[PDB]
Structure formats: structure tokens, C-alpha cells
Coordinates of C-alpha atoms in Angstrom, one line a residue:
X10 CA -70.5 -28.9 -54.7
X11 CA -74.0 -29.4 -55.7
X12 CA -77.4 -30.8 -53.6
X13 CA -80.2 -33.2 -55.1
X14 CA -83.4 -32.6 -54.5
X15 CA -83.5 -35.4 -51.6
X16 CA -85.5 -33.6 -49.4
X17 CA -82.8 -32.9 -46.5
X18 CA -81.1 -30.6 -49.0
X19 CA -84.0 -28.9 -50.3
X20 CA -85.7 -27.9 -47.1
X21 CA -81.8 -26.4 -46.1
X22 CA -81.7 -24.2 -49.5
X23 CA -84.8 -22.7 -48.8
X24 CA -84.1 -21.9 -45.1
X25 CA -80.8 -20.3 -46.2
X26 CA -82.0 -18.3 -48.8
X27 CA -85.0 -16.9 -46.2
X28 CA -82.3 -16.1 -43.8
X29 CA -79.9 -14.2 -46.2
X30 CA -82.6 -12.5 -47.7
X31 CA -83.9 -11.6 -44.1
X32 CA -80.2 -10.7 -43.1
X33 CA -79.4 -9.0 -46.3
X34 CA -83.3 -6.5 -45.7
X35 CA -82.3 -5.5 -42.7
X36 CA -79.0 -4.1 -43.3
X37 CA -80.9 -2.2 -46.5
X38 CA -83.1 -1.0 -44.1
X39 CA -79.9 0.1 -42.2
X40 CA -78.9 1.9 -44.9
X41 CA -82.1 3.9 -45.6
X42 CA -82.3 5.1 -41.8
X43 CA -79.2 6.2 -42.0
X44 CA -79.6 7.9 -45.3
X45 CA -83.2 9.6 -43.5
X46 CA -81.2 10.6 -40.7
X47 CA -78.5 12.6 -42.9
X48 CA -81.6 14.0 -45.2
X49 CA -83.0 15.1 -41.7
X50 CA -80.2 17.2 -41.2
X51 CA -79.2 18.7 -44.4
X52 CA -82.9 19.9 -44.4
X53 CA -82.0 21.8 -41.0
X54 CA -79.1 22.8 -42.7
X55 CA -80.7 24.4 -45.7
X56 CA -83.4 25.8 -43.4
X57 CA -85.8 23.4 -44.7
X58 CA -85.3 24.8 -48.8
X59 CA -86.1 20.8 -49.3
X60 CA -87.6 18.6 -47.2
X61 CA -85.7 15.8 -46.0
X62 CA -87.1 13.0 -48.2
X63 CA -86.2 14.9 -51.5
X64 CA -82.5 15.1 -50.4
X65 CA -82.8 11.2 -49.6
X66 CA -84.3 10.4 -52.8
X67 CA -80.9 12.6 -54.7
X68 CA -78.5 11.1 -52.4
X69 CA -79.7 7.5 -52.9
X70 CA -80.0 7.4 -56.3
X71 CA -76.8 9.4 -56.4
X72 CA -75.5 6.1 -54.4
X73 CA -76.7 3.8 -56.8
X74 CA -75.4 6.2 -60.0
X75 CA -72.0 5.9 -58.5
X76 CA -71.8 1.8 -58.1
X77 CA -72.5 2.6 -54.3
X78 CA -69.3 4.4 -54.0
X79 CA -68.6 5.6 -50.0
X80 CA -66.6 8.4 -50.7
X81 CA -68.2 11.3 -49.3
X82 CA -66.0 13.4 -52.4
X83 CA -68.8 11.6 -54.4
X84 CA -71.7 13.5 -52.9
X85 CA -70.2 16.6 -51.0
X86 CA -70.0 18.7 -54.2
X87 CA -72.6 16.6 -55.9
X88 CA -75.2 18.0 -53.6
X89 CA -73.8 22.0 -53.2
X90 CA -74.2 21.8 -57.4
X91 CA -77.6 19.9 -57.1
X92 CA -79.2 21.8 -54.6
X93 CA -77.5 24.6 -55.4
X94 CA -76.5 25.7 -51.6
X95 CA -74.3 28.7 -52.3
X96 CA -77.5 30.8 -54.0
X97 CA -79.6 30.0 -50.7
X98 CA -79.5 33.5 -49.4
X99 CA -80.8 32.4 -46.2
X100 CA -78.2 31.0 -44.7
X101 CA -74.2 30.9 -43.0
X102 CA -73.0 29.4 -46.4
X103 CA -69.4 28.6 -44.3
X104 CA -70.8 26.5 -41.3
X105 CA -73.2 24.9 -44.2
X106 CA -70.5 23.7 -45.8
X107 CA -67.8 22.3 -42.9
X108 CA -71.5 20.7 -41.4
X109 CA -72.0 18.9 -44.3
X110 CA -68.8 17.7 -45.0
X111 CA -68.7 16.5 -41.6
X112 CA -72.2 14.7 -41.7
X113 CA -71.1 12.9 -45.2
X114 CA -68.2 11.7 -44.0
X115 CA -69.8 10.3 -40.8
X116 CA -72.6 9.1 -42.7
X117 CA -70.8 7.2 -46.0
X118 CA -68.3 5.4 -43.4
X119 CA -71.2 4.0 -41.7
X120 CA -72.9 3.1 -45.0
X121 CA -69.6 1.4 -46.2
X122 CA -70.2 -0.7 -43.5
X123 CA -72.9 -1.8 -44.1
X124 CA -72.5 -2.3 -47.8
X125 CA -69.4 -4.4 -47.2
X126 CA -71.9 -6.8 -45.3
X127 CA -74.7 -7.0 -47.8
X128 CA -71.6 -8.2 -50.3
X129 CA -70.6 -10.7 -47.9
X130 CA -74.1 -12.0 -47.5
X131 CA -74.6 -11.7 -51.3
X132 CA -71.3 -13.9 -51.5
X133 CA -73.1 -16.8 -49.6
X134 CA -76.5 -16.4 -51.7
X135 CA -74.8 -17.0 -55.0
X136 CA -72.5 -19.7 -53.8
X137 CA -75.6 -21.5 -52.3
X138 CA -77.5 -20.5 -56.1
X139 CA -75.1 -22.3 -57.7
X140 CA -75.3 -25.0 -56.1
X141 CA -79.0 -25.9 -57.1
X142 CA -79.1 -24.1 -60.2
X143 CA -79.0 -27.6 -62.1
X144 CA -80.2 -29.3 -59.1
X145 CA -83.4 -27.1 -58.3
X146 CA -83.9 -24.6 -60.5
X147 CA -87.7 -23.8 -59.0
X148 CA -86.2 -22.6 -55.7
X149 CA -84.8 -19.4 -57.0
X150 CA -86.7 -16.9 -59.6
X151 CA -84.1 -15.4 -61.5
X152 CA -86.7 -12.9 -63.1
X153 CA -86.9 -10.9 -60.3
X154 CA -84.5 -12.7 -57.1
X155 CA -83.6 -8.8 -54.7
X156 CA -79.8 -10.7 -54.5
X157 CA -79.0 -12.2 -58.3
X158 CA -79.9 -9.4 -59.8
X159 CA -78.7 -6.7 -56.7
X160 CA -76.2 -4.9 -58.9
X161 CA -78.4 -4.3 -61.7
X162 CA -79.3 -0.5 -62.7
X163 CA -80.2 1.4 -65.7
X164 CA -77.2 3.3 -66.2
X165 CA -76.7 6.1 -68.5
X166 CA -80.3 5.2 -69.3
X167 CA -81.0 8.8 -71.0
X168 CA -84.0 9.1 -69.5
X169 CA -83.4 9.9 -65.7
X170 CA -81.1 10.7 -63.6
X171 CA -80.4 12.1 -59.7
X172 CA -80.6 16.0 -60.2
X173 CA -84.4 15.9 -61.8
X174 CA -86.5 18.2 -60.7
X175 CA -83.3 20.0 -59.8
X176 CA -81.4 20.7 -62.6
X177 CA -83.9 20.0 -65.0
X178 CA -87.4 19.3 -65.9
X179 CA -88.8 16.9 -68.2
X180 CA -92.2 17.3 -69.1
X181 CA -94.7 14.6 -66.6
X182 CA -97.9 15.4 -69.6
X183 CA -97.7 12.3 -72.4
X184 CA -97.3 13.6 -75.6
X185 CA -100.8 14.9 -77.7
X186 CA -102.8 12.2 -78.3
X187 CA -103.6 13.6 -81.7
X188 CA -99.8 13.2 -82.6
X189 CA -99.4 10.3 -80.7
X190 CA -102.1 8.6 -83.2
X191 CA -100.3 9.8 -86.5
X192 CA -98.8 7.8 -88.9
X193 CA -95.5 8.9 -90.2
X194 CA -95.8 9.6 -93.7
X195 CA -93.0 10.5 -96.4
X196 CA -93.0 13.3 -99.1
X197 CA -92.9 12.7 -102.7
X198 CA -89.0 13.2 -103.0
X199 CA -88.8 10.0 -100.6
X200 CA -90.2 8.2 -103.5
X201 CA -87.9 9.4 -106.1
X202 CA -85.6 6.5 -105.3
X203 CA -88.5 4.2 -106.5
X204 CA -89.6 6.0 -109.7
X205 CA -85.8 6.6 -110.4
X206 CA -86.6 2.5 -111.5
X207 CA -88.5 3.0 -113.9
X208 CA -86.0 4.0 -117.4
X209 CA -83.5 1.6 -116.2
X210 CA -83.1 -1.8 -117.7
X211 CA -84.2 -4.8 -116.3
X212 CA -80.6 -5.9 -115.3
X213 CA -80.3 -2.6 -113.5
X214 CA -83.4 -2.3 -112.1
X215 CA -83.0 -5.7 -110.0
X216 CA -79.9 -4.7 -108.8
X217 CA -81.2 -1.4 -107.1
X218 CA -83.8 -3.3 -106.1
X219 CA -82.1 -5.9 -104.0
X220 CA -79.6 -3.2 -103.1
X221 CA -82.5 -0.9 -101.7
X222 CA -84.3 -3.6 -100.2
X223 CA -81.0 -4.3 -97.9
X224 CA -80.6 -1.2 -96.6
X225 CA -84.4 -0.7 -96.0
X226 CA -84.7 -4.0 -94.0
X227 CA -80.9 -3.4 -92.1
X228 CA -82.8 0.3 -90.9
X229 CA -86.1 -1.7 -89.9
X230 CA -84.0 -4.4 -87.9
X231 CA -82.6 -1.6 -85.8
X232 CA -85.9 0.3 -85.3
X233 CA -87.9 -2.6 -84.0
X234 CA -84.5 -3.5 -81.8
X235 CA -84.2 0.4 -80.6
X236 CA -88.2 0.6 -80.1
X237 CA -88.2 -3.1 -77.6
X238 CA -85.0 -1.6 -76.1
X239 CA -86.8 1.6 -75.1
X240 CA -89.3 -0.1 -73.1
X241 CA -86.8 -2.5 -71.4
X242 CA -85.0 0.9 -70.3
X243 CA -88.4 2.4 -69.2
X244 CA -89.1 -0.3 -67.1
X245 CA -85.8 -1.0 -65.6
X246 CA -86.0 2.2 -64.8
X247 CA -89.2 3.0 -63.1
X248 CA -88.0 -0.1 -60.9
X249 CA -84.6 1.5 -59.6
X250 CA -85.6 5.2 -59.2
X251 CA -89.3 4.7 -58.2
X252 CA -90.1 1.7 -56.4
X253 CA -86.6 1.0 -55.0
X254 CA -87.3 -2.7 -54.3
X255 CA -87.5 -6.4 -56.1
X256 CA -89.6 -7.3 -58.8
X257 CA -89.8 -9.1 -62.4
X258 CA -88.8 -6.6 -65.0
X259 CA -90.2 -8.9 -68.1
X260 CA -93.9 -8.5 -66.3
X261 CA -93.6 -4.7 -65.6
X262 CA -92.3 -4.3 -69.7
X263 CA -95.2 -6.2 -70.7
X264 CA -97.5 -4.4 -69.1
X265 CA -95.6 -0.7 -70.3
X266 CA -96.0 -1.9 -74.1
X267 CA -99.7 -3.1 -73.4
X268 CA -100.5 0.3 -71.6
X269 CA -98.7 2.2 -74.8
X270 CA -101.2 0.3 -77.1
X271 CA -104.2 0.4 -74.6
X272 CA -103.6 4.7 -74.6
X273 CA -103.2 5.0 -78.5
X274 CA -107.1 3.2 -78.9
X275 CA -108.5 5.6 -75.4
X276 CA -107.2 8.8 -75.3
X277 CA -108.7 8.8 -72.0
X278 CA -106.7 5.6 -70.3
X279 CA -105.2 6.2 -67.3
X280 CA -100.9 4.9 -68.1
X281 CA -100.4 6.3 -64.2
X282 CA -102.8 4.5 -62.5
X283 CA -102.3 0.8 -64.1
X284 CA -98.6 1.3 -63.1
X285 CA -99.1 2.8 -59.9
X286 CA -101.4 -0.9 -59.2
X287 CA -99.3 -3.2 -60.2
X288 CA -96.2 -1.8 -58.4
X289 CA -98.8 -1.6 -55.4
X290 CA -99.3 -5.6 -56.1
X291 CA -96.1 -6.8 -56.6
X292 CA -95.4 -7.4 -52.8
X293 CA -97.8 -10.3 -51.5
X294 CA -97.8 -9.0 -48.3
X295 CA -98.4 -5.8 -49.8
X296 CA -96.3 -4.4 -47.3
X297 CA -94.0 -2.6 -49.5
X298 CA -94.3 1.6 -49.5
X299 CA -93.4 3.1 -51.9
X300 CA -95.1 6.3 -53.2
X301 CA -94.9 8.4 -50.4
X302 CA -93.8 11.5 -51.4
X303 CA -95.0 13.3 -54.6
X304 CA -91.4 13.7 -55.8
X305 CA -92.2 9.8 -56.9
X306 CA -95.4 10.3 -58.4
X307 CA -93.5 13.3 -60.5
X308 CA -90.3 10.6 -61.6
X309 CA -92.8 8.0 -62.5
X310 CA -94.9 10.4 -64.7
X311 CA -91.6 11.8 -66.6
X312 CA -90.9 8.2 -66.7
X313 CA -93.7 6.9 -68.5
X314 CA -94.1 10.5 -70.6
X315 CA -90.7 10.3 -72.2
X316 CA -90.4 6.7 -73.1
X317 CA -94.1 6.5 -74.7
X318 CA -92.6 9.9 -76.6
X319 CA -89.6 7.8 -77.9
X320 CA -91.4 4.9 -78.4
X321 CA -93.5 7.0 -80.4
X322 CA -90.6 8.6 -82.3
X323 CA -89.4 4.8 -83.2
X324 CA -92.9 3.9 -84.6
X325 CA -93.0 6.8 -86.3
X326 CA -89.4 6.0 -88.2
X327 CA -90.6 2.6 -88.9
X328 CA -94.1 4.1 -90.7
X329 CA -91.7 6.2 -93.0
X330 CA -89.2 3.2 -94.1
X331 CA -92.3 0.7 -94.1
X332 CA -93.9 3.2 -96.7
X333 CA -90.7 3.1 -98.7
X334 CA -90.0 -0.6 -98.2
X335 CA -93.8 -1.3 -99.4
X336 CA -93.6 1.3 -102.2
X337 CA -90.5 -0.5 -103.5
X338 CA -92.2 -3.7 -103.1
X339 CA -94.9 -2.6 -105.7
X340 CA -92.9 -1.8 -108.1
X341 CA -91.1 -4.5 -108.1
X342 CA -94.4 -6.5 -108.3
X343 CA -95.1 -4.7 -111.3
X344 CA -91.8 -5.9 -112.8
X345 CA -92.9 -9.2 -111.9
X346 CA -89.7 -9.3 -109.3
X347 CA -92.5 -10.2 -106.4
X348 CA -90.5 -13.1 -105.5
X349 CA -87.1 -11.0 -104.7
X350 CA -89.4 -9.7 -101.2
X351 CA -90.7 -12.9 -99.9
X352 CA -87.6 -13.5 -97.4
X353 CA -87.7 -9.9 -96.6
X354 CA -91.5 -10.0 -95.9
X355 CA -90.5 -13.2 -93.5
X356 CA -88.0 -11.1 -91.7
X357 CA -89.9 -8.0 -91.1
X358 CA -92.3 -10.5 -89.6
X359 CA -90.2 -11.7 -87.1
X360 CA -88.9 -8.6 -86.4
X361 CA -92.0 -6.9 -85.7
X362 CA -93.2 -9.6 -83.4
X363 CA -90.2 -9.3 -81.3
X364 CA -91.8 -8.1 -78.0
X365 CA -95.6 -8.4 -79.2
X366 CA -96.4 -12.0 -78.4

């Protein structure tokens, strides 16, 4: 089935798709009470060792690591290894444990629940999507629609995960700006491969040359792909494990790249706070809450810390083959092999500008 955009059928699509997303809010909202109210009580349990909302914040993302899985087997000895229960010397480790078994199992049957009725919503939102997506494409934003994009999430993203600040802890300081700044250079061995040119014949020479110039543009095409990558992954996943709610991902990398650049000119630019606005602007209504515990603040700084670091490490990388890449490209102008380069030169254009425009 499919609706023109006579006026009856467009004023119906946008009613329904307020209404499931209405419906579809408050059962999330559901599902975040009832993930407070088990936090509450594991707090009690633990005799307040963490405070509720950094036992929400593990168990959600936990949730969302695990495809939304209901089991409470996912979780119970998730969260003895996480927060590390059986060490708490403070305690009745054996009540503790039948208590929390209990409360997960109560808990994740209530949350399946509700999950099984977001899918069926989710159901009707697509099948009314497709319906207008040749029609009226303008009524749905596909950038950043909560539903269409609902089962996204950055996983095995390298970068974060639930037990953080638990089980481990990433640095939240950016790398030294003096470092940051560096250009990566090579050592004279590097360049051996170049002067290694010069007692071979002609013939041989623009052989090796080609060859080289293969493998040195093949290395470059998967820098600049790793490097755009890296911010993608930063991005999607300051969205799932610190703001927890709908927005465009393609704004939010734009503004991570320009914020990587803007730092590299000031060492004194302030990444955090430009991030910390726009995700306080995304919501019109401005209605959405977010950073309200400093276990978010401490996620987003690690965050934006260890991509820029990668990021870093990429552009580095690409300096050292660049420097190679442009060494062998003098030589071979001084061969008078400039031409063999210029559909290299084009592609290391276009790959470089990947991201950047």
C-alpha cells in the first residue's frame, strides 16, 4: 500500500507517527522507572557502596550491550563481577545474593513486557514509513528518527563499554597538546626503499616505482577510511552511553571532527563544553535531561579523550606514509617519471577529503 500526498493522507501520517512516538516514550519511560526502582534497591542492598543511578547507568547499558536481552542470567552475575559484591565486607553476602536474584527476575519480566510492546508499536511505525517513503519522504528524518534507527548501537565499539569506571579506567585528560600538534616523521632507514632506486636501471626503477606507489596509496586509503570511521564510532557512541535519546549522528560527527581541528590551533579550547551545548540543544523543547550525574560527565570525557587520541594515532600514520609517498614522488620527478603520480595525486585527494567538506 502506499498514500499520495493528497492532503487527507498526509495529515493521517503525521498524526500516527505523533501517536507512536508518544506511545512508544512512554513505555521507555516505563522502562527507566523500573530500571530506577531496581537501582534503588541494589543500592540498599550494597549499603549504599554505589548510588542508585550508577547501578542504572551499568544495568542499562548492560541492556542495550546484550540486544535488550530479559534474562535476568544476563545481569545477575554481570553485576556480582561488576560491582564486585562478594569483596564488600560490609555486608550478609548470602541474603545479597537470593535478594538480587529475586529483584532481577521480578524486574527483567516486567521489562520484557514492555519491550515486547515498544516492538509492536515499532512494527506499525515502519509499516506506516513505508508507505510514504516514495510518497513523502519530508515527513520522516531518517538522520536521526528515535524508531528507524531504535536498534542501532555501537557495539564492540572498542572504546566503551558497561563496567567503566568499574573495571577499568580510561584516562578523561586529552592527550598533550604538544604531542597532539606533532607531525609524524620517519627515520632515514624509512627512506632506504627510495635511495635503493637510485643504481638500478631505468626499466627497474619504474617498476619499483609503480610497485611502491601501490602499496603506499592501498595503506593511505585505509588510514583516511580507519581515521572517518573513528569519529563515526565516537559519535555513535557518545549518543548511546551518554545522552540515551534521539538525535542526528552526521551533525554530532561534524561537529567532533571540527572540535579535533578547533583544539589542535587553541590548546586552550574547551572539546567538553561545545559537546555538552549541542547535546543540550538538540531537543527543541529542551526538555531532555541528561547530564545529571557526574558518572556522565566522566563517560563523555573518556569519550572524547580516547577517540581524539586515536584519531591522532591515524594522522600520525598517514604523516609517515605521506612522507614516504612524497619522497618517492621526488625521485621519481627527478627521473622525469612525474607523470606515473598524477592519478595517485587525484586519489589521495579524494581520499583525504572524505569527511572534510
Amino acid at each position: 500500500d502506499t498514500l499520495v500526498n493528497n492532503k487527507e493522507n498526509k495529515e493521517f501520517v503525521l498524526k500516527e507517527k505523533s501517536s507512536l512516538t508518544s506511545k512508544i516514550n512512554k513505555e521507555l519511560a516505563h522502562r527507566t522507572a523500573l530500571f530506577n526502582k531496581l537501582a534503588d534497591n541494589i543500592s540498599l542492598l550494597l549499603n549504599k557502596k554505589y548510588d542508585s543511578f550508577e547501578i542504572k547507568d551499568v544495568l542499562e547499558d548492560r541492556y542495550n550491550e546484550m540486544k535488550r536481552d530479559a534474562n535476568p542470567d544476563v545481569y545477575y552475575i554481570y553485576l556480582m563481577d561488576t560491582l564486585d559484591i562478594e569483596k564488600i565486607e560490609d555486608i550478609n553476602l548470602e541474603e545479597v545474593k537470593m535478594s538480587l536474584l529475586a529483584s532481577l527476575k521480578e524486574t527483567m519480566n516486567k521489562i520484557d513486557t514492555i519491550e515486547k510492546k515498544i516492538e509492536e508499536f515499532k512494527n506499525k511505525y515502519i509499516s506506516l514509513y513505508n508507505k510514504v517513503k516514495t510518497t513523502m519522504p519530508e515527513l520522516f528524518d531518517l538522520n536521526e528518527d528515535l524508531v528507524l534507527l531504535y536498534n542501532d548501537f555501537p557495539f564492540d565499539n572498542g572504546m566503551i563499554s558497561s563496567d567503566i569506571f568499574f573495571k577499568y579506567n580510561p584516562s578523561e585528560n586529552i592527550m598533550d597538546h604538544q604531542e597532539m600538534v606533532k607531525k609524524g616523521s620517519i627515520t632515514e632507514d624509512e627512506l632506504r626503499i627510495v635511495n635503493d632506486l637510485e643504481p638500478l636501471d631505468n626499466y627497474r626503477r619504474r617498476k619499483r616505482i609503480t610497485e611502491l606507489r601501490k602499496i603506499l596509496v592501498e595503506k593511505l586509503r585505509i588510514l583516511y577510511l580507519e581515521k572517518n570511521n573513528l569519529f563515526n564510532t565516537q559519535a555513535s557512541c557518545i549518543k548511546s552511553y551518554c545522552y540515551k535519546n534521539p538525535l542526528n549522528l552526521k551533525t554530532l560527527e561534524v561537529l567532533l571532527k571540527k572540535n579535533y581541528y578547533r583544539l589542535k590551533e587553541n590548546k586552550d579550547y574547551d572539546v567538553v563544553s561545545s559537546i555538552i551545548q549541542h547535546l543540550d540543544n538538540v531537543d527543541a523543547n529542551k526538555k531532555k535531561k541528561w547530564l545529571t550525574h557526574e558518572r556522565i560527565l566522566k563517560k563523555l570525557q573518556v569519550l572524547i579523550a580516547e577517540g581524539y587520541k586515536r584519531i591522532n594515532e591515524k594522522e600520525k600514520d598517514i604523516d609517515r606514509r605521506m612522507a614516504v609517498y612524497n619522497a618517492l614522488y621526488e625521485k621519481a620527478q627527478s627521473y622525469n617519471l612525474q607523470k606515473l603520480f598524477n592519478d595517485s595525486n587525484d586519489f589521495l585527494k579524494k581520499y583525504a577529503i572524505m569527511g572534510n567538506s
